[PDB]
Amino acid sequence: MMQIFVKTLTGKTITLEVESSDTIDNVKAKIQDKEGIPPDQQRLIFAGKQLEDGRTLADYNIQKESTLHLVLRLRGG
Template structure:
């Protein structure tokens, strides 16, 4: 298991497809699922519709910020995962 300390928790951003940046406090032990909950609090987007991308890879809900080695100034990219339906 990789253990890394994430410093300065207030310096993490989530960027939407429209270019809007959301600043979040992200602690090292936060799971990606909790980060998605924080995005929902600020933007109203349900976690089930969110996909967070870091370093070109989709982040797994059960991993922590420390496991992804999120550092100060890190930017996560938010992609909406909208499910298709019948017309």
């Protein structure tokens, strides 16, 4: 179980609790509850690097309360 701080585009950094062997897909599902933006255009960028969509939290060697900044891609409107 890994606790992480994900920083939405709204600037709000929420504490998201997921499994260590879980996937970024579930992280997006927590984020979409806050941002309301589907996982299709929301991407995760940690330390200035994009993380593969769906990777395990422990894969990038994340620790408790690490900061994950997300970037939204332009959605057609």
